[PDB]
Structure formats: C-alpha cells, structure tokens
Ligand SMILES: Nc1ncnc2c1ncn2[C@@H]1O[C@H](COP(=O)(O)OP(=O)(O)OP(=O)(O)O)[C@@H](O)[C@H]1O
Ligand code: SF4
C-alpha cells in the first residue's frame with residue numbers, strides 16, 4: 098500500500114511565549130478539538146508539548162504560531178529505525194554514531210547542529226545515551242543492545258568495563274580560554290605534565306606544531322590558532338589507545354592545519370585508534386582512512402551514515418545528495434565560477450584605484466614588510482598565508498587603524514572594515530546595532546536570502562550580543578560591513594566559526610555585491626575554495642611566522658595560486674567527476690610531471 | 706625521474722633526482738642491463754658507466 | 765542531448781538512424797535498444813533522424829526482461845562504429861553500436877556499463893561517467 102510515514106515535532110522554547118499567543122497551539126489543533134492528546138500543556142515550565150503519537154501532521158499549528166516556534170515534518174520513518182539519544186521532549190535527537198577502528202583514522206563531516214559533538218561524548222563515556230528513552234542511571238548495558246548489528250557494539254562493551262579511557266580534545270573553541278588558566282600556569286606546564294611519551298616527544302611535538310614561541314604565554318593569552326594547537330599537543334602526549342579530536346582545524350591557518358593533520362595521523366602508525374571531526378575537506382581527506390557523513394537539519398536531527406572510503410565519502414558529500422537515505426541534504430549545489438563565466442568589462446573606473454607604496458610596520462618583536470602594489474576599481478584581492486605573518490597588520494594599516502612605522506597610506510577613500518576575531522564589545526541588541534549601520538540593506542532581498550531567513554535573526558533581534566553564538570555572530574558581522582557604502586571594503590577571515598553552507602553563502606555575497614556596485618574588496622582567507630570564487634588577484638605572504646613576514650603585489654589567479662601552493666608542495670590535480678582539488682602525494686611521477694608544468698590546481702580551463 | 710644508484714664495489718647506495726626531459730631521455734628505449742655513459746645525464750657523472758637493473762613506474 | 769546534458773557537444777558523424785538497433789550496455793536487463801527517435805534532431809523531408817555518440821534517443825527494448833519490453837524509454841548512445849572525427853584530427857570507431865537506458869533527466873537505469881565508453885558521451889552525461897570503466 099502506501100509507504101510508512103511519521104510526524105516529529107520539535108519546538109524551540111526560545112521562540113515561544115505562551116502569554117502573547119495564549120496557549121493557541123492547543124486551541125487551534127484539530128486533534129484537541131475532538132478531545133485528543135496531540136498537544137498537552139505542561140503546567141510547570143509552562144511550555145507547549147506536542148506528542149508525536151497523536152499529532153495528525155496537519156501543520157495547522159505551525160502556521161498559526163505567531164513567531165514560528167513549532168516545526169512539524171513528515172518522514173518516511175527514516176529516523177525511527179536509528180534512534181540513539183534525545184535531549185528531551187521536543188528537542189534535538191541523535192541518530193547513529195561513527196565507527197571507531199584501531200590503527201586508522203575515521204573522519205566525520207557535517208553541518209553544525211548534527212550531533213558530531215554529542216557523538217564524541219557518547220564514545221568518550223562522558224554522557225550515557227538515553228536511547229530516546231528513560232535510560233539514565235548507568236545503563237550502558239542497554240546501549241550495547243541498541244547498537245547490535247553495528248560494529249559499535251564491541252566498543253560499548255569496552256567502554257563500560259573501562260578498559261580504555263578515551264582522551265578528548267574539547268570541541269568548543271570559544272569556551273576553552275575561560276576554563277583553563279595557565280593550563281594552571283602556562284602552556285609549557287601542560288606539556289611537561291601530560292608527556293607520558295618520550296622526552297623526545299616534548300621537543301618533537303612542539304617543533305612540528307610551531308609551538309616554540311607560545312610555550313611561555315598563558316592559555317588565556319593565546320590567540321585562536323595557538324589555543325587550538327596546545328590541545329593537539331596534549332592529545333599526542335597522553336598515553337592511551339583512543340584519541341578523539343573534535344574539530345582540530347578551527348582557528349588554524351592554512352599551513353598549520355595541514356601540519357596538525359600529519360601529526361595526528363602518526364597515531365595510526367602506532368596502531369592507536371583515532372577519530373576526528375572536520376569542517377575542512379582538505380584536512381579531512383589527508384587524515385582519514387574512512388569517512389562518515391552526518392546530515393539532516395540543524396538542531397533538529399542528524400544521522401550518521403555507514404562507514405565509507407576516504408575518496409568515496411568526499412565525492413558523495415559534494416553532490417548534496419545521498420542515495421540510500423534518499424535525501425537532498427543541501428538545497429543548492431556548490432559550484433565555482435570558471436573565470437570564463439565572469440563578466441567581461443574594461444576595468445579601471447577612474448583610471449585604476451589607489452596605490453600603496455612600500456610599507457613597514459615593526460612591533461619590535463615582529464616586522465612586516467610590504468612591497469608596493471596597486472589596486473584597481475571593481476576588483477577583488479585575496480590575501481593568503483599563515484597567521485602571524487602580518488596579514489591582519491596589513492589590513493589594519495589600510496584601514497587607518499594602524500600607523501605604519503615607515504611608508505604612508507593616506508587615502509581619500511571611505512573605508513568599511515570587518516575585524517578578524519569577533520568578540521562582542523558593543524552594548525545594545527543585535528537589531529539595533531545593524532539598523533544603525535544601515536536600514537534598507539535589511540530590506541533587500543539578497544539579505545533575506547543570506548542572513549535573515551537562514552538563521553532566523555528575528556528571534557536573535559532581542560538577544561544580546563554577549564548572549565549570542567559564534568557562527569551566528571560571524572555572518573551578521575560580514576553583512577554589517579556591506580551595510581554601508583564605501584569605495585573599498587576590507588574583510589578579514591570570514592570563514593571562522595562557519596560550516597560548509599555558511600561560508601559559501603558568504604562567497605556568493607562578496608562577489609555579487611562587488612561586481613554590481615563596482616567597488617573593490619580585499620578579503621583575507623585560509624579557505625582555498627572561498628578565495629577562488631571571490632577574487633581576481635591575490636597577494637601571498639611568506640616568511641616565518643611570529644618572526645618576520647613579507648607581502649607581494651597583486652597578481653593573477655593562476656600566478657598567485659602557483660606561488661602559494663608551491664610553498665605547501667601539495668598539488669591538487671583535478672578529480673574528473675567532482676572537479677574538486679585532488680591531493681597529490683610527495684615524490685611521484687604524476688605529481689612530478691606537474692611540478693614541471695606549474696599546475697597546482699585545475700579548473701574548467703585549458704591546460705595539461 | 707629519481708635514480709637509484711648503487712656502487713657495489715663498496716656496498717654503497719644513494720638516490721638522485723633528475724628533472725629535465727633531455728637529461729633523462731638518455732635512458733629511453735634503453736633496456737634492463739644496457740649500459741649508459743654518464744656525462745649525458747650530468748656533469749657530476751662524467752665518465753661514469755651505468756648498467757640499468759630495474760625499478761618502479763608510478764603506481 | 766537536451767535535459768541534464770551539462771555541456772555542449774561538437775558535431776559528430778551520425779551513425780544510427782531510426783530503426784537501428786544497438787547493444788544494451790548496462791545491467792538493466794535489456795539486451796538491445798531499438799532507436800525510434802533522436803532528441804534535438806531537426807527536419808528535412810525524407811531524412812531519417814539519426815543519432816551519434818552521447819545523443820539521447822527514444823528506444824524500445826526488442827530483446828530483454830519482459831518488464832522492459834513493449835515500451836518506449838530514453839537511452840543514451842555510448843559507442844558508435846560509424847567512424848567519426850575529433851578536433852585533434854582523429855578518425856576513430858568502436859566495434860559495436862551501443863547505448864544505455866536512462867531517464868529524461870539523464871540518469872542511468874542500471875548501475876554498470878559493460879565495455880568502453882567514448883569520452884564525448886562521458887563528458888556529456890555525468891551519471892554515465894560514474895558508471896564507466898575504460899573511457900575512449
Ligand atoms: N543540552 C541539550 N538539550 C537539548 N538539545 C541539545 C543539548 N545539547 C545539544 N543538543 C542538541 O544536539 C544537537 C547538537 O550538537 P552536537 O553538539 O551534537 O552538534 P555537532 O553535531 O557537533 O554540530 P556543530 O557542528 O554545530 O558543533 C543540536 O542541534 C541541539 O539541538
Ligand atoms: S509558540 Fe507561538 S503561538 Fe504558541 S504560545 Fe508561543 S508565541 Fe503563542
């Protein structure tokens with residue numbers, strides 16, 4: 098007959114105020130009219146509760162809700178089979194979990210809110226899964242049963258017995274500074290205590306990670322990239338079998354994230370089990386032997402797929418569709434402009450834009466050098482390189498925030514600027530802040546697509562910025578820079594705290610407005626793909642981090658990309674199906690052939 | 706390509722890296738066991754004679 | 765060509781006029797494909813419409829699982845035999861005429877493609893790329 102279906106309702110309490118509506122949910126529902134149970138009022142917490150058993154799937158309640166607090170979805174009973182854990186009534190529920198394997202590295206990739214973080218806790222022994230039920234007083238026993246038919250069953254027996262104690266590298270990057278000071282006192286102390294391994298391990302681990310400078314600094318003092326790496330150090334130093342990493346690429350620069358990936362992989366060689374979660378595909382590919390994909394709506398649900406190969410899992414990810422599950426997880430496919438695709442205009446505007454001379458900025462501990470370059474109108478320039486190179490310093494000077502030690506840049510131009518690390522320091526609510534900058538930008542349809550509808554800022558409008566979240570704040574900041582008119586716009590590292598969909602919304606944003614408005618933009622980035630889409634020229638930075646650095650004039654996309662990628666020595670041939678960068682291993686004949694051609698990347702362009 | 710050179714009088718060995726199609730090409734259509742006079746491949750190896758013994762393709 | 769064909773296609777010699785039968789080269793259960801129409805073909809009194817490499821046709825299955833017989837469906841030509849000529853100057857030809865049953869969007873009905881597949885078809889129909897072994 099007909100296929101089977103279900104109803105699931107998740108309500109957000111933040112969005113709900115029963116006083117204004119009245120308990121309208123109960124009154125409007127047709128089941129309750131009849132005298133049924135579908136919506137029950139909880140006198141206590143004073144929240145509406147919707148029971149999935151009695152609900153019709155009508156959706157009448159959803160429309161009537163004045164805010165948009167209720168969500169009812171109909172699924173083919175895809176979710177019911179898999180239930181691992183649920184937070185509570187009408188809240189996030191997790192489905193499936195990632196397999197662990199000894200001697201190898203298993204990847205995880207998904208959009209935020211999927212339960213990748215939750216999954217780690219369950220494997221860690223930190224949290225016990227309720228099984229979408231009562232299971233609470235240590236009922237590890239029931240969890241093995243639920244896992245039967247899955248390879249995780251063996252793991253759960255091991256965890257309960259406590260033969261193995263997993264080491265976890267904590268996920269939330271913002272939270273860590275508050276938790277630890279010193280580790281107690283200074284990063285160096287942490288590394289000495291934790292070092293179960295070789296005395297060589299202390300030195301070796303620090304050298305490879307580029308921690309040398311950072312040892313004396315305290316944890317609270319650390320910058321985001323530095324903060325991440327110390328955590329990684331402790332996860333090598335520890336003695337154990339299972340090493341869990343949760344988002345190790347966060348905050349890190351392009352050079353550093355690759356470095357972290359290699360070191361982490363070394364664990365597999367000692368035949369120690371490794372698990373990892375990543376937002377970055379370049380990093381994910383290198384680390385993993387096996388990959389899981391986590392999909393589903395954010396904060397509603399997230400299911401883990403069956404284990405897959407490294408190459409295979411990545412390929413399926415980019416399609417935006419999964420066949421067994423039969424879900425189009427992402428509404429639109431990701432594509433990069435060919436450069437054939439772009440509009441052809443004679444560019445200058447007023448003959449070229451402004452130009453800067455050689456600049457120098459010296460702190461007295463770090464020195465930045467800049468080579469005279471030129472900027473033109475309606476163009477976009479990417480800035481790449483490792484952090485501590487003075488990528489941030491350079492942008493500031495152009496902003497006029499910083500004064501150069503030598504050189505000068507006094508432009509007539511009006512500048513809008515977005516800072517790299519965003520910490521709130523503005524009193525006021527989110528809507529008020531954005532309205533002051535510009536209203537009318539808020540009216541535009543473009544802004545509805547990218548900001549307002551996806552996150553639901555309407556709910557955020559009353560919330561304080563101190564009270565806010567990381568990724569949500571990021572999209573808002575990028576948009577705000579665009580809020581006001583300026584000849585030149587400056588953005589620094591827009592990719593931070595953002596998942597796949599979120600960054601790509603940003604990529605479309607910068608390119609489209611700049612093209613249209615005929616204004617120029619400088620964007621700093623670590624993400625390969627984001628730079629490619631937005632830019633026409635690039636500046637590459639080089640030197641040694643935390644010591645000195647150098648900048649170059651803007652150069653074409655092909656030219657700049659070869660230089661940058663030559664510093665890394667990883668080529669990204671091309672995958673014929675995905676058109677994705679495909680990484681090339683060191684000493685090789687195929688990779689060797691490329692080195693003689695000068696092609697690090699490939700696109701829909703002519704080339705051998 | 707990368708050359709794997711052995712000096713089997715001493716029991717020594719080292720690798721070498723040649724980029725340059727023309728420097729390589731001296732080895733082409735040469736078979737296993739064929740001798741190859743050195744200077745063609747470099748100035749270091751001038752006079753040196755090499756008997757080819759095997760080796761690996763990509764993959 | 766048409767729907768789901770991302771890419772354009774450079775002209776290649778027409779090999780297969782209506783009435784032609786090609787080998788079915790998937791694992792769908794179909795043994796052959798009988799061409800009744802070429803998509804995107806034009807009109808001239810008396811001319812048979814005729815397909816080539818990476819053209820989408822409309823076919824019936826003359827030989828094959830009965831659940832596939834007695835009806836018209838889309839297919840895509842994957843191997844030719846009439847020799848044609850590429851822009852690198854080459855005149856080339858396969859040993860058989862063959863295509864694979866497919867949906868208007870261009871998705872394979874089957875999961876494998878047995879034998880080789882010409883690149884001009886691979887380049888044209890991504891789900892055909894996927895299921896192809898040796899290309900060209
Ligand atoms: N205390 C809680 N009560 C109810 N639901 C919770 C709670 N903690 C987490 N969740 C739910 O579990 C899901 C989230 O977390 P997890 O921490 O499992 O996410 P991730 O999968 O690691 O995603 P992200 O990439 O955004 O960090 C969320 O969408 C949320 O709805
Ligand atoms: S969820 Fe909406 S309609 Fe229901 S009580 Fe809250 S505000 Fe009123």
Ligand code: SF4
Pocket residue numbers: 125126127128129135136147151152153154155156157158159169
């Ligand atoms: S969807 Fe319909 S049936 Fe279910 S709770 Fe809302 S109104 Fe009641």
